[PDB]
């Protein structure tokens, strides 16, 4: 029955070929091992399309489901590593660290994240959440001599290993509140009384579920990791490790707790009204470019939770369409953060000023991905927010969409601040690149993957709202298999 895990086991094989080539060839393999992982990720993406027609079987003795919801989130995490490898082909190759050793830990977080989306046992949820979390502490401290990545690998460890123990104590209680029954469909058949033991088991698991998606009482790691980590890892944990926490929350809170449902829809509203406020008002007071996108990912998380708390067939379709276009907004913005951090050092705001005459492909990429993150027409993040407020207005929730719209205008002001210091500043107002920009080439190592990860992302950011109707049908078929 091991034909349903084929998109993950192709990524298991190419995880080992890029590992052995580092051992066999010894840093001469870094010229080809990124491109082998790209077709390893592309071959893992292209085998999800024959799995889309299959009628959603539950393989591996009831511990793994191969539904359309599990295949949608598997492609989002596989595209997150596909966009990350096109970034880090030059980024960690410039720090002097090994390139094949980076993309091995990057692919264990991918297959660890991709197995979260279809897991149904309490143990396989925790095992795949571990190898996503354990791999990500090694990636935020991969540079290993910065006193900023080492400080970010520590804070992510002592919260990540802590919140996965709060997650285990709620997962172990689900084994004990039922008579055994580690599987989540077998959990719901045993417990429906909504006792106090089910409440503490619910709070304990969304201390780790809402830790990967960074809601405000559990968000404290996110702005400190995202400025210390390497920027491709910052690009990965915002769409790959964040959608995997959202891949868990649909598979967990709807399968393990369909009786207790008005409680976690009451907690996640508090998680939404706090992360929409504190994601978007604290991003005003940010000077670093990676720190402005850090509170953005907390703020954009609250928009995804708008469709998660309404609990409708269009509500879960609103959070899957927003997470799909979220990959085309973060990985296009973080590409321009990397592409500006490689030409000049010190990637922060009030150093992008005086651009658009020296790097016009960077400013067209960074503006159209940050303006779409604010949700302005006719970009992809406008239509993604429209469907969140359409599904938000559909079943109650009139104060969430009003807070979702009022914090979207506060969202506009700090995104347009970066577009202010890219295109509206005169050429007598640039601090860095004042005749210091390196006169871009697109001929060095890894810049051509960095350019095609920018061109094909802004095209997927400008046109994914106009051409959203294939994406609206691809998302709405992944919701009928959600209870």
């Amino acid at each position: 029955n091991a034909g349903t895990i084929l998109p993950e086991t192709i990524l298991i094989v190419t995880l080992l070929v890029v590992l052995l080539a580092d051992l066999i060839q010894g840093r001469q393999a870094d010229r080809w091992t990124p491109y082998f992982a790209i077709v390893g990720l592309g071959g893992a993406i292209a085998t999800m399309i024959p799995l889309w027609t299959q009628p959603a079987t539950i393989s591996f003795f009831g511990s793994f489901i191969s539904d359309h919801l599990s295949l949608f989130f598997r492609g989002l995490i596989a595209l997150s590593a596909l966009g990350t490898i096109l970034m880090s082909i030059r980024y960690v190759e410039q720090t002097g660290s090994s390139l094949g050793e980076f993309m091995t830990i990057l692919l264990t977080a991918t297959v660890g994240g991709m197995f979260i989306a279809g897991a149904q046992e309490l143990v396989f949820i925790f095992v795949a959440l571990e190898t996503l979390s354990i791999a990500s502490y090694l990636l935020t401290g991969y540079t290993k001599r910065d006193s900023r990545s080492n400080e970010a690998a520590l804070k992510y460890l002592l919260i990540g290993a802590a919140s996965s123990a709060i997650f285990l104590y709620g997962s172990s209680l689900l084994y004990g509140l039922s008579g055994g029954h580690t599987q989540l469909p077998a959990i719901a058949q045993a417990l429906s009384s909504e006792s106090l033991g089910l409440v503490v088991a619910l709070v304990f698991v969304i201390a780790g579920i809402s830790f990967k998606i960074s809601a405000v009482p559990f968000h404290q790691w996110t702005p400190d990791v995202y400025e210390g980590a390497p920027t491709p890892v910052v690009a990965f944990l915002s769409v790959g490790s964040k959608a995997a926490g959202f891949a868990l929350a649909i598979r967990f809170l709807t399968l393990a707790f369909p009786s207790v449902t008005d409680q976690w829809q009451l907690i996640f509203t508090v998680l939404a009204i706090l992360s929409m406020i504190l994601g978007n008002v604290v991003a005003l007071a940010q000077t670093s470019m990676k720190r402005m996108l850090a509170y953005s990912s907390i703020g954009q998380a609250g928009f995804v939770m708008i469709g998660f708390v309404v609990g409708t067939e269009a509500g879960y379709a609103s959070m899957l369409f927003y997470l799909l276009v979220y990959l085309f907004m973060n990985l296009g913005a973080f590409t321009c953060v990397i592409l500006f951090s490689l030409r000049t050092g010190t990637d922060q705001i009030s150093e992008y000023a005086g651009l658009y005459q020296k790097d016009p492909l960077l400013t067209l990429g960074l503006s159209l991905c940050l303006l779409s993150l604010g949700g302005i027409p006719p970009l992809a993040g406008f239509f993604g927010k429209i469907y969140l407020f359409w599904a938000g207005w559909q079943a109650g929730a009139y104060g969430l969409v009003l807070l979702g719209l009022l914090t979207s205008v506060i969202s506009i002001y700090y995104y347009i601040r970066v577009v202010k210091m890219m295109v509206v500043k005169e050429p007598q107002e640039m601090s860095e690149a004042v005749r210091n920009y390196p006169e871009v080439s697109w001929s060095s190592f890894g810049l051509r993957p960095l350019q095609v990860g920018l061109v094909m992302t802004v095209i997927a950011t400008s046109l994914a709202g106009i051409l959203a109707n294939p994406l609206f049908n691809l998302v709405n078929t992944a919701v009928w298999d959600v209870p």
Binding site: S63, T95, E121, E130, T143, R145, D347
Partner: protein, 191 residues
Amino acid sequence: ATLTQTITFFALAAAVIIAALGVVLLDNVVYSAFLLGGVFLSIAGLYILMNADFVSAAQILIYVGAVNVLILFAIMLVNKRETYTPVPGRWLRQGGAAVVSLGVFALLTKMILQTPWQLSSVPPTPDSITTIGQHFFSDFLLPFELASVLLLMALIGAVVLARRELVLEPEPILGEEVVPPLELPERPREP
């Protein structure tokens, strides 16, 4: 007959929480790590009473023999003869952590006592080394193969995060602007 399984429980149930108070409250860090094995060996003694003779021996092999040795090797590497004794660093923020720890315990003891547990009156452990290996390949098979990729990653990453930079430490490979080796290109600055 029956009381000899109960008086050995509370002798072990007090041996774990006294050693757990020893790893937390003691001023010496090496005394915490040697008492950390006192936590792990007492829990391993608690598994034998709970009919878990394999996981009992699986804790002495890993938590006592592998993790506690790895902790102790990574404490004798960090001594520095510098404690600096700044107890009241910012405020009395060690009293706010005593509130939540007694609060979670007051939460769970209310939760553990009032919950009706559906304990089964069937005979347990029919040679529980074969029913745990039949479980590694029928039900818990996909967790079992992913544990190898988790361990392989934990050997890749913890080596490259702890090995000595003796290959090329002064290594300026290239530059568009100047970037130090084994450091992120976003250089720190004040606004």
